[PDB]
């Protein structure tokens, strides 16, 4: 889109409509006449724009009014309420900009925010830019979170986030113009190679994919329409329904063979019924002719009766002879009808073992997308975030993604090697207890006005707790943690001295022998300037290949590359790296998913802050003190980076509105 129009769409906002969030802060306007709304909506879109064409400099309010035109600049309390709402929610002035008015000499309020994962720094940049004092507690010796960039020598390769899922309304678009990010386009051609090491026939490759999507769509219509959603008392997983669709389809190839082979016995037993009338005329003809010959034996002259016995036997045999040609005429239409029914037989199989094994790979691609076996995804809700896809081709960062958190961490107070342990939140404030990871012996106490927990959903899930909440998190939160899904996928990085793959393909598949191994090393990526290949390990294989040493994996890896490109063309890798995200201390998994029995409405329970009870009985219900960010908190954008960054912007807006007031609301 184009103009103050595309501004609103690039900020994920309906250009012609006021949102639930703006109704909150401008309930006068949304309640008011439709004219005033359009002057708001234009100011909102005009501001959003101004921020977006130049996002390396702050957008002061004074700067906004000046560039804005009449009649829309006639009102300046409105232009202030708009600009102040935007800046507070990260729609303008977020990320790494240059300040115009530098920071207040004296700060206000204290937040301790746990984890410098990307959602983490997202808030700390915003909380700090609102003149708060932010300190940042990170258990690693690095700032990335699940954004992890391997770098040895010239080689660069992401074992965590890799792909910008398209700049069409992506906040990550804003960061790219702000940060030096080399954004490489990803070309969508993916050649599947079966286990042998040779390519799938271009006709098979379209027949399987097209089938796989029709089976997917089936579960959708199975789910949202036929309402097949509980079976035997449990919720249906996409895995189950995907299978139930196939048995209704392996049933149908057989309902159609039975119907066709039963139409052959329909007419094979009309031919039988016909050839019986025809053998029984051949024989009524045999005897008549016999009788008619013996009637010509009487030599003329003959009395008239014995003349009729020749003519009658002649009329009788020409009549019974006429019937038989009708019955070998009818046998004619059947003999070719029967050779054509048998000649166009229905589908002999539903899917072959060669066919299903390629169907597998499309399920591995689903298991990558979702970091879990399809047996665990919720059938109804797994794709519930679909509506918010970004438009545009996907990309990758050729100098590595880490380059982004690292950028987002400049100017910020970050304590590394600091494993939070207990969160203590009370009506009067918060203390957070942290050890040093290196010595586990230095203990730290951090007191603060509120705590922002960007603790990955797997950490939060961990039994026994890696972090103790004091007081315990309310049941409605902990149940939302149990119900949710934190899943697994891993990455094998392969690092060679020379480019032996096809340089002009970014990514290609490998097709799995079993269903069980459908996850195992099922997809490869060539992305970086250096000879680098990169293998996904999703599915059930994800969690399994963690119990198997690096070499066995890089073995199975080179095994695949050999079959596919020829033993001789596959050198040894100079450097190799397997990820173990399910075993990583401060991850416990890869990213979240909508587990069966979960909804996206758990993603929203996840983000409701915690208000501690009254300290003194009968004291006024306090301020909320414990806030949650992270990719597992943002319903409309789960399990991405941009979704995490977005959540940190959210809370930082929420934390400021609670502790610095919201002056834009009268």
């Amino acid at each position: 889109p184009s103009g103050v129009e595309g501004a609103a769409f690039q900020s994920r906002l309906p250009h012609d409509r006021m949102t639930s969030q703006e109704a909150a802060c401008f309930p006068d306007i949304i309640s008011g006449p439709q004219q005033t709304q359009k002057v708001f909506l234009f100011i909102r879109n005009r501001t959003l724009q101004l921020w977006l064409d130049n996002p390396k400099i702050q957008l002061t309010f004074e700067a906004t009014l000046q560039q804005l035109e009449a009649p829309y600049n006639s009102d300046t309390v409105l232009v202030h309420r708009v600009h102040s709402y935007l800046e507070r929610h990260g729609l303008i002035n977020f990320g790494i900009y240059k300040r115009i008015k530098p920071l207040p000499t004296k700060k206000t309020g204290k937040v301790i925010i746990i984890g410098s994962g990307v959602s983490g720094l997202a808030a700390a940049r915003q909380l700090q830019s609102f003149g708060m004092d932010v300190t940042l507690l990170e258990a690693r010796d690095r700032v990335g979170g699940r954004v992890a960039t391997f770098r040895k020598g010239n080689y660069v390769a992401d074992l965590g986030a890799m792909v910008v899922t398209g700049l069409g309304g992506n906040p990550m678009a804003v960061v790219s113009k702000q940060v030096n990010m080399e954004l490489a386009k990803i070309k969508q051609k993916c050649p599947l190679y079966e286990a042998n090491g040779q390519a799938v026939p271009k006709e098979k490759d379209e027949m399987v994919e097209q089938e796989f999507n029709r089976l997917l769509e089936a579960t959708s219509k199975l789910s949202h329409q036929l309402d097949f959603n509980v079976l035997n008392n449990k919720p249906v997983s996409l895995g189950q329904a995907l299978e139930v669709v196939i048995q209704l389809q392996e049933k149908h190839v057989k309902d159609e063979q039975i119907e066709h082979w039963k139409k052959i016995v329909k007419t094979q037993e009309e031919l039988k019924e016909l050839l019986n009338k025809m053998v029984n005329l051949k024989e009524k003809i045999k005897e008549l002719h016999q009788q008619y010959k013996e009637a010509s034996e009487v030599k003329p002259p003959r009395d008239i009766t014995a003349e009729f016995l020749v003519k009658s036997k002649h009329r009788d045999l020409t009549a019974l002879c006429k019937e038989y040609d009708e019955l070998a005429e009818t046998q004619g239409k059947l003999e070719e009808k029967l050779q054509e029914l048998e000649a166009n037989p229905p589908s002999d199989v539903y899917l072959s073992s060669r066919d299903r094994q390629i169907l597998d790979w499309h399920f591995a691609n689903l298991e990558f997308a979702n970091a879990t076996p399809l047996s665990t995804l919720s059938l109804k809700h797994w794709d519930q975030d679909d509506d918010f896809e970004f438009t545009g081709s996907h990309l990758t960062v050729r100098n590595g993604y880490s380059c982004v958190p690292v950028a987002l961490a400049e100017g910020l107070d970050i304590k590394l090697n600091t494993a939070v342990r207990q969160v203590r939140y009370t009506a009067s404030g918060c203390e957070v207890i942290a050890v040093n990871t290196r010595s586990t012996s230095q203990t730290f106490i951090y007191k603060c006005d509120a705590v922002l927990c960007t603790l990955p959903l797997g950490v939060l899930k961990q039994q026994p707790p890696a972090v103790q909440f004091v007081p315990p998190l309310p049941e409605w939160k902990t149940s939302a943690v149990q119900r949710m899904g934190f899943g697994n996928l891993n990455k094998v990085v392969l690092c060679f001295d020379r480019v032996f793959w096809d340089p002009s393909v970014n990514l290609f598949g490998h097709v799995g022998s079993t269903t069980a191994s459908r996850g195992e090393l099922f997809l490869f990526w060539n992305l970086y300037k250096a000879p680098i290949l990169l293998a996904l390990v999703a599915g059930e294989a994800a969690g399994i290949m963690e119990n198997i040493s690096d070499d066995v994996i890089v073995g199975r890896c080179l095994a695949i590359l050999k079959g596919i490109f020829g033993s001789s063309a596959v050198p040894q890798p100079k450097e190799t790296v397997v990820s173990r995200w399910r075993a990583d201390p401060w991850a416990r998994g890869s990213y979240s998913y909508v587990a069966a029995g979960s909804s996206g409405n758990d993603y929203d329970l996840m983000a409701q802050p915690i208000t501690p009870g009254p300290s003194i009985p009968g004291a006024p219900q306090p301020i909320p003190r414990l806030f949650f960010a992270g990719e597992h908190t943002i319903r409309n954008y789960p399990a991405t980076v941009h979704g995490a960054l977005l959540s940190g912007l959210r809370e930082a807006g929420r934390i400021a509105d609670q502790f610095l007031g919201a002056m834009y609301t009268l």
Binding site: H362, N370, D385
Partner: peptide, 15 residues
């Protein structure tokens, strides 16, 4: 979730 696919983007269910 589905938005994560970059290759062979599934399509059965997108509406």
């Amino acid at each position: 979730a589905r938005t994560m696919q970059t290759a062979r983007k599934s399509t059965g269910g997108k509406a």
